């Protein structure tokens, strides 16, 4: 329960959804060569890729409901 990412009987799809986004991006930063994949894919530098990921850490999936 105190661990981050624990669900329970009221957690919704937006909460579960944004959680799996945030640890997704932490995993992207967590590897060492998938960044070389994204840097070879679209033409950037690795620091630009890291900064774009860290800026898209709090943005994505927008505002909540209501």
């Amino acid at each position: 329960s105190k661990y981050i990412g624990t669900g329970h009987a009221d957690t919704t799809k937006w909460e579960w959804l944004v959680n799996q986004h945030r640890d997704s991006y932490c995993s992207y930063m967590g590897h060492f060569d998938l960044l070389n994949y994204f840097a070879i894919a679209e033409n950037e530098s690795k620091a630009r890729v890291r900064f774009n990921l860290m800026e898209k850490m709090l943005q994505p999936c927008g505002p909540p409901a209501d």
Binding site: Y3, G7, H8, A9, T11, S24, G30, C61, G62, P63
Partner: protein, 144 residues
């Protein structure tokens, strides 16, 4: 070294694992755990899946000890079977309209989730987007 000696244990674990008594379910589930830890990376899965389909409907049971042995049983089946097939037998009634089955499937989901979250990255089911928010990780969809 009991990897070639699991087959005759399986119908033996069928009359064992079928629904008779608390000691059968509890201790036999602990046998599911210990077998599941003895075979780990050692070339045997489909036997254990045929175990797993008999393991799974036993979840809805009220006694705390036997549901605890079910929990550790599912943790052993997690570490031997893999995260994928656990989650595929998990996702069914996550959003079911009833709190009783929700406490169940959330509780199993947390016990899945604490153990090795980092393996879950590829095995997430992709869900396509609604109108208001973006749900597609294009990072998994770039093409050379």
């Amino acid at each position: 070294m009991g990897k070639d000696y699991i087959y005759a244990v399986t119908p033996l674990l069928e009359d064992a694992l079928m629904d008779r008594d608390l000691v059968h379910r509890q201790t036999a589930s602990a046998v599911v755990q210990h077998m599941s830890l003895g075979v780990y990376g050692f070339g045997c899965e489909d036997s254990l899946n045929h175990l797993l389909n008999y393991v799974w409907p036993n979840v809805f049971e009220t006694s705390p000890h036997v549901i605890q042995a079910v929990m550790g049983a599912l943790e052993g089946l997690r570490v031997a079977i893999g995260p994928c097939r656990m989650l595929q037998y998990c996702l069914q009634g996550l959003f079911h309209p009833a709190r009783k089955v929700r406490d169940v499937y959330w509780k199993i989901y947390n016990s899945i989730y604490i153990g090795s979250q980092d393996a879950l990255i590829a095995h997430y089911p992709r869900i396509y987007n609604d109108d208001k928010n973006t749900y597609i990780r294009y990072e998994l969809d770039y093409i050379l």
